[PDB]
Ligand binder design. Structure first.
Ligand SMILES: *[C@@H]1O[C@H](CO)[C@@H](O[C@@H]2O[C@H](CO)[C@@H](O[C@@H]3O[C@H](CO[C@H]4O[C@H](CO[C@H]5O[C@H](CO)[C@@H](O)[C@H](O)[C@@H]5O[C@H]5O[C@H](CO)[C@@H](O)[C@H](O)[C@@H]5O)[C@@H](O)[C@H](O[C@H]5O[C@H](CO)[C@@H](O)[C@H](O)[C@@H]5O)[C@@H]4O)[C@@H](O)[C@H](O[C@H]4O[C@H](CO)[C@@H](O)[C@H](O)[C@@H]4O[C@H]4O[C@H](CO)[C@@H](O)[C@H](O)[C@@H]4O[C@H]4O[C@H](CO)[C@@H](O)[C@H](O)[C@@H]4O)[C@@H]3O)[C@H](O)[C@H]2NC(C)=O)[C@H](O)[C@H]1NC(C)=O
Ligand SMILES: *[C@@H]1O[C@H](CO)[C@@H](O[C@@H]2O[C@H](CO)[C@@H](O[C@@H]3O[C@H](CO)[C@@H](O)[C@H](O)[C@@H]3O)[C@H](O)[C@H]2NC(C)=O)[C@H](O)[C@H]1NC(C)=O
Ligand SMILES: *[C@@H]1O[C@H](CO)[C@@H](O[C@@H]2O[C@H](CO)[C@@H](O)[C@H](O)[C@H]2NC(C)=O)[C@H](O)[C@H]1NC(C)=O
Lengths: 146, 333, 99, 50
């Protein structure tokens, strides 16, 4: 979940020269429920009014905050199901009787190939967050299992 | 000669801050459009471009003159000196007029005070596509516009007989959709400021499947029918059947990528994505079926003998049943 | 004919190569909603590869039970498929270079 | 590791007309807010003014 804010302040006028408030204080912000985000969902929003104290004085401030919860269906179907299915295909090597070495080698190493291809395509398509994430951990788990 | 005097008189004792008949009655504005084009509809951002000629006609009794000339036909030069309605497009992510070589406005003032004001706009309207039945989906995306500051009791919009009219409809930059028709509408919306007359021009579009057929449906279908070959391959060709199955899996994943590559990250099962998932499940099932057959060989060869003959007819018939149900259900919407 | 793994690997891996090539070519093309000349070429080529692997499927099915007809169909396929591809290429290039 | 610079100065006024100096000590005249680090890849260690 992401807590995305929008901060509204006065540049030069201080609290003893200007005051901010929400007109209604519960119904000042409208249209949040009608928003349709393809990838997220507005679970909650809040309105805050305060006075931030800076060195030279107190300045009025309003804050509009949203809590975005990212949908999971797309990620499941496009990243997690394929990984698990390739993992099962990797497991199929056990039922194949040992004496067939070409078949077991082909199955195992081609499952490794497919796992790598899926991982690289997910690199390519997904947003480029260059630090470690939960999805990265899951794909490493799957690749380790293969 | 005389026209300069007419204009100087017209703008003498004028006040462009006040709408015509500020305190008497609402100003009635007749609006026309001429859609030069409807550009791409990129489902990723849920927006569609549109290039139009927006014309508004109203009545201003301050701009009434008497003279042998029945109409004054001016440039954009005067547009900034007389009152112009603050019409704006309520569903535009980013719109802009055109300014080359000279502002693309147009002003015309008649004897009786009728003003006609035309400009050329390119509007990136927003419409939230409901991406079910992809790629067999049909949408109706609006271009809405209303005054920004004048409520219902100050400015009222009103369509005409031939208000909105399309052009060739062949030079349009529509790629995957196809133009089918349009409708004009008028409503009154409630806003924080007041009640605003909102005018709408719905444009109806239908996606065209000539691309997704060749891209996904045909290759996925052929890959499945190719994976079936393992059944007819003898049961002793163990490495051959294993490689066949797994290579078909790899190809199917390659295809499943390009499947979704086109669409935004909608978190629901679209139709084409359901199709590709089902094809991948069929390939998965074929490979695991061969695996189970191979495992049963060493234990019960008689039991394994009938499994191949069962699968040979159960897989094709199952796929045909799925295809019939699918293509019938998604085209009945 | 006995080299069943070898011929199966040709079939499947050539299908994979043609898949990749078609994906790349239609990635290069804009996302129009109708068939282009390159798209027709790709479609016919993919059909040809599918036909090749199907011919293997049938020849393998018949082999070890009817070698005479297996070899007969294999020989006709050898003689025919290249000829059909060549005629397709000739007519295609003619029709799309005359314009 | 990198040292990304932010160099500013006066355009059109030379050293003999407009001289710039930090209002306080050099490293106390450029302050990064405590929540002001919008980097995914790197880690802002610290600044160094001059
Ligand atoms: C934060 O800061 C931002 C930046 O400071 C600020 O953005 C600025 O906002 C202002 C106010 O809205 C903009 O100023 C207006 O701009 C209009 C044009 O906008 C388009 O073009 C500009 C570039 O402008 C060039 O082109 C026009 C058209 O030819 C010229 O008129 C301009 O002078 C200028 O031309 C010079 O440069 C050319 C090269 O570019 C040369 O070739 C040329 O020879 C000139 O040297 C673009 O920047 C705009 O893009 C941005 O804005 C649009 C908004 O629509 C966005 O959608 C877009 O995405 C971009 O963000 C846009 O493309 C001008 O038309 C306008 O001038 C008229 O209005 C003012 C005030 O009303 C008048 O004083 C002025 O005289 C003009 O009125 C006369 O002419 C009009 C013609 O339409 C007549 O209708 C009118 O009646 C009037 O005639 C009378 O006066 C005439 C005198 O000229 C006289 O001859 C007549 O006879 C008669 O008496 C105005 O200047 C400014 O462009 C924005 N800048 C930028 C970078 O965006 C932002 O608002 C700030 N935010 C806040 C919250 O404060
Ligand atoms: C998203 O983040 C913002 C800020 O990080 C959160 O704002 C915080 O909201 C809480 C609850 O409203 C505030 O606590 C309040 O403290 C005051 C004391 O002055 C008290 O009078 C209130 O009754 C309440 O206990 C907190 O001050 C406020 N923080 C800031 C920096 O404004 C917000 O709750 C988070 N969630 C959402 C959905 O926005
Ligand atoms: C466009 O809007 C008009 C007005 O809302 C619709 O109705 C016609 O309007 C003209 C001008 O007032 C009348 O002369 C006609 O008699 C109206 N026809 C009706 C009510 O059927 C018009 O139908 C709309 N057209 C489109 C294509 O949306």
């Amino acid at each position: 979940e992401q807590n995305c804010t929008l901060e509204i302040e006065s540049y030069g006028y201080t609290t003893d020269d200007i005051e901010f408030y929400w007109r209604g204080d519960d119904n000042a912000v409208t249209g949040v429920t009608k928003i349709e985000l393809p990838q997220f969902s507005i679970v909650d929003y809040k309105l805050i009014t305060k006075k931030v104290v800076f060195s030279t004085g107190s300045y009025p401030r309003l804050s509009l905050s949203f809590k975005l919860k990212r949908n999971i269906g797309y990620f499941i179907l496009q990243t997690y199901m394929p990984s698990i299915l390739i993992t099962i295909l990797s497991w199929v090597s056990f039922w194949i009787n040992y004496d067939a070495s070409a078949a077991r080698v082909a199955l195992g190493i081609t499952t490794v190939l497919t796992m790598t291809t899926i991982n690289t395509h997910l690199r390519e398509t997904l947003p480029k967050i260059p630090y470690v994430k939960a999805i990265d951990m899951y794909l490493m788990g799957c690749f380790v299992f293969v | 000669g005389d026209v300069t005097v007419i204009l100087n008189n017209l703008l003498e004792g004028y006040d462009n801050k006040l709408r015509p008949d500020i305190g008497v009655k609402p100003t009635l504005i007749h609006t026309d459009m001429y859609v030069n084009s409807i550009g791409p509809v990129n489902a990723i951002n849920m927006e569609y471009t549109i290039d139009i000629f927006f014309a508004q006609t109203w009545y201003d009794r301050r701009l009434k003159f008497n003279s042998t000339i029945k109409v004054l036909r001016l440039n954009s030069n005067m547009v900034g000196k007389i009152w112009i309605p603050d019409t704006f497009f309520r569903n535009s992510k980013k719109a802009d007029a055109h300014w080359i070589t000279t502002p693309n406005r147009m002003l015309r003032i008649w004897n009786d005070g009728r003003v006609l004001y035309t400009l050329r706009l390119t509007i990136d309207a927003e419409c939230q596509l409901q991406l079910h039945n992809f790629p067999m989906d049909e949408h109706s995306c609006p271009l809405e516009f209303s005054s920004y500051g004048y409520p219902r009791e100050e400015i009222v919009y009103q369509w005409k007989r031939s208000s909105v009219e399309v052009g060739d409809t062949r030079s349009w930059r529509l790629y995957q959709f196809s133009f089918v028709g349009l409708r004009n509408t008028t409503e009154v919306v409630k806003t924080t400021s007041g009640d605003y007359v909102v005018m709408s021009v719905y444009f109806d579009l239908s996606r065209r499947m000539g691309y997704f057929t060749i891209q996904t449906y045909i290759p996925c279908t052929l890959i499945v029918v190719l994976s079936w070959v393992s059944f007819w391959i003898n049961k002793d060709a163990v490495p051959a059947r294993t490689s066949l199955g797994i290579t078909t899996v790899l190809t199917m994943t390659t295809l499943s990528t390009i499947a979704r590559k086109s669409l935004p990250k909608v978190s629901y099962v679209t139709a084409m994505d359901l199709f590709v998932s089902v094809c991948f499940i069929f390939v998965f099932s074929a490979l695991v079926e061969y695996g189970t057959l191979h495992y049963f060989v060493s234990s019960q060869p008689a039991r394994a003998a009938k499994m191949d003959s069962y699968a040979r007819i159960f897989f094709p018939t199952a796929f045909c049943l799925f295809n019939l149900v699918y293509w019938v259900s998604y085209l009945y919407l | 004919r006995e080299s069943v793994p070898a011929r199966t690997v040709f079939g499947v891996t050539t299908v994979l190569t043609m898949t990749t090539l078609s994906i790349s070519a239609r990635n290069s093309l804009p996302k129009v909603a109708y068939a282009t000349a390159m798209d027709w070429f790709i479609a016919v080529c993919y059909a040809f590869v599918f036909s090749a692997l199907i011919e293997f499927a049938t020849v393998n099915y018949f082999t070890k039970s009817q070698p005479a007809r297996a070899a007969k169909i294999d020989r006709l396929s050898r003689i025919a498929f290249p000829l059909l591809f060549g005629i397709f290429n000739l007519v295609y290039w003619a029709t799309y270079l005359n314009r | 590791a990198h040292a990304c610079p932010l160099k500013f100065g006066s355009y059109a006024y030379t050293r003999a007309e407009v001289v710039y100096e930090w209002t306080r000590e050099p490293a106390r005249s450029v302050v990064v807010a405590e929540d002001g680090s919008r980097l995914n890849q790197y880690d802002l260690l610290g600044q160094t003014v001059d």
